[PDB]
Symmetry: C3
Subunit: 35 residues, 3 copies
């Protein structure tokens, strides 16, 4: 598995972003890699 790229979906505690992106909520259920 790879670190998640910019603007792609991530899951805290399960599937995280490539640094320096941060996994941020974008709605009630989903998160995206932002930064």
């Amino acid at each position: 598995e790879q670190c998640v790229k910019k603007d792609e979906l991530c899951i805290p505690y399960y599937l995280d972003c490539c640094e320096p992106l941060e996994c941020k909520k974008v709605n009630w259920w989903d998160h995206k890699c932002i930064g």
Copy 2:
């Protein structure tokens, strides 16, 4: 390889946790993903 999940074993500098978990020592030799 995947990021390490909650309460599973991690190794600093070698096998790290899924954010926002942190790899913490739990005894003399082992580390676990906590948070």
Copy 3:
């Protein structure tokens, strides 16, 4: 894919280091995992 090990090449936003290493520029184009 795995997190990048100490003194190996990394790419911010694409191929990141094993914590607690940080991906730092080492010249105009390349980055390395330091820490």
